[PDB]
Design a protein around this nucleic acid. Sequence first.
RNA 1: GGCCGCCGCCACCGGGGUGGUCCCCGGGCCGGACUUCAGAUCCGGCGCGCCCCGAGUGGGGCGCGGGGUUCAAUUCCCCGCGGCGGCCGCCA
RNA 2: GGCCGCCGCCACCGGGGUGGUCCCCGGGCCGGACUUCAGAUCCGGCGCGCCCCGAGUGGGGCGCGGGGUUCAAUUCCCCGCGGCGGCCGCCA
Lengths: 247, 250
Amino acid sequence: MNHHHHHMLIILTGLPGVGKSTFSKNLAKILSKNNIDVIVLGSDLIRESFPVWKEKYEEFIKKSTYRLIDSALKNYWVIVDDTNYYNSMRRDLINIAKKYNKNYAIIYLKASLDVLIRRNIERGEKIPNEVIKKMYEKFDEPGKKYKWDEPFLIIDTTKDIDFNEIAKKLIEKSKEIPKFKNNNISDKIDKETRKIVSEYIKSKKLDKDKIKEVVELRKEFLKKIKKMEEVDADRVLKEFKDLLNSY
Amino acid sequence: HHMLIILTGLPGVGKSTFSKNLAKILSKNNIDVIVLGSDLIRESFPVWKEKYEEFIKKSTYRLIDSALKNYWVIVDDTNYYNSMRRDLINIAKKYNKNYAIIYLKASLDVLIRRNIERGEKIPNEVIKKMYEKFDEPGKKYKWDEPFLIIDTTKDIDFNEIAKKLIEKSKEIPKFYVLEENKNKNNNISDKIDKETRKIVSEYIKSKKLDKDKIKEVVELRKEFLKKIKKMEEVDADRVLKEFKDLLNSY
RNA sequence: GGCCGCCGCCACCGGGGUGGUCCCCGGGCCGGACUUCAGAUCCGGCGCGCCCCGAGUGGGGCGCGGGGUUCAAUUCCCCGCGGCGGCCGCCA
RNA sequence: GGCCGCCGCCACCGGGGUGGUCCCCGGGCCGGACUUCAGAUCCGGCGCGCCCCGAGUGGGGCGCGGGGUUCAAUUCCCCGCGGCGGCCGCCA
Ligand SMILES: Nc1ncnc2c1ncn2[C@@H]1O[C@H](COP(=O)(O)OP(=O)(O)NP(=O)(O)O)[C@@H](O)[C@H]1O
Ligand SMILES: [Mg+2]
């Protein structure tokens, strides 16, 4: 262009402790080195702004986190640092991308439940180990249900991560193009002639060669009519009925 | 029921910490409070750029805005300028919520020391100028007067501050108590007022009264209007004539 | 900090009116009189500064940013300070 | 993860329609008028399998996932194969 390139929305998905926040910062840092304005957003920003947790804050948290992401994707790349364990959650974020016609990439961060538990402890078990175990089970494997849900990259956070390799791949994708009546006159003659035939065939017991003859007659009739300029169904449909009765 | 708390103080003064400790106490006092500041969105970017500031400011004000409709909001920001503090106040005014500016101060010596302990991400030089040119709140506008001034180098009784803020939340805001065209006396009573008033002005001129007798006439009208507002059904014309006559025999 | 608009500079609080030394509505508070008595209520009142009188308790006078008009300015006119709204400037 | 839906299996492609041996709309392509070249316009036509006739660079026949309803299915119903989506599951 200016050979083209643009900006997009990155959706992380993975369980607690898997490495989303850390991954985000690193991915974010490399993208900067690439003259790309990127910001990292997640529900935890607002959730942890409350001194304590209450189920009743979640509606504000989710709605607030979506506005930030929405208004951010208008100017910047956005890395959504969130678990997003339900596919419907990922769809919601994708809709924001679609809303602005931007590309999107779902990045799945994986780790054995063994590692997740170990890590959850190292942190203080603020989330019950039992909770980490259930979530691990309930997790919606990305792409298992919908094609739009297929992960752009699956990443094992138990091994090294080539943030340069990843940044490159994302940038390449950002250059791609995100793509995400009433019957007329001729249509009436078709629907009509067809009915007329149905009627005629039920009216006279006829031989096999007879049915086929009628059917061919209709075909020729339609052909001739698409030829004529101005035409009226009542006039023509009558001509058809009469031609049929002469057999 | 609920208000907007505006913190103001130089970098390293202890805002973030103060915020979190004040919030925790408020929660114990069954108050739904959230802590918001421009650093939340600013630090979400991997690097800093002057061109982000407009988005950061805009985004942060929207968060505080929509949060103040349901929760107490503690604005954890330097708010170096009173113009910023005014901006935050107008958000409070917009929902007719009470507000309180809490000023946190510490000596330049402490600020410099703290800034180092951090990593000097902010040039000492900068901390100094910010400190030197920083104008304390309330020196120019009364609405900018801090509700409390807290020295972070000394102990801080959070239960006290909380108890104080809660009392203040119950008070009535005074932003919109500037549009109360109510309690007007019926259009007729108001006519008698406006008319007797003119009738007196005419009388005073026609008899070139002195300061003394003028005051008597003024008092006479006061007594007249008092008596009239005690009557049930009344007609201006009849009443006004009665006043005129009264004055004429005076 | 600037420009534009509107408002305040009559004095318990809010609003309103108004060429009458302020007034009205709404709210609050203060003092006197209320049968050797308390007490709702009726009568008077409400800020600050200066001055004067009074033993004191207390009472009275002048003033309310500057200036004009006028017998008289809270009101009308010119300026000054301040508030609110709008737009801009500022915004490690 | 639960519940459910849509499109294709008529045949150049996509969308829509329909118990008539397919039709309509839009796009593309081959052949003809057309003859520098291209264009406009018009005309004829467009897939696969197996088989018969002729053997020019030709014509014809049966079939188009299985079953059913039927004279007739692209259409309606059951299943199969294929392509895809929707709602809800919400710090966990
Ligand atoms: N790539 C990594 N390899 C090993 N450990 C990591 C990695 N990244 C992060 N960790 C550690 O794993 C724990 C959680 O990491 P974090 O990146 O915060 O995961 P998260 O998904 O963001 N957590 P949460 O926000 O609670 O869902 C901390 O001890 C991290 O330091
Ligand atoms: Mg995290």
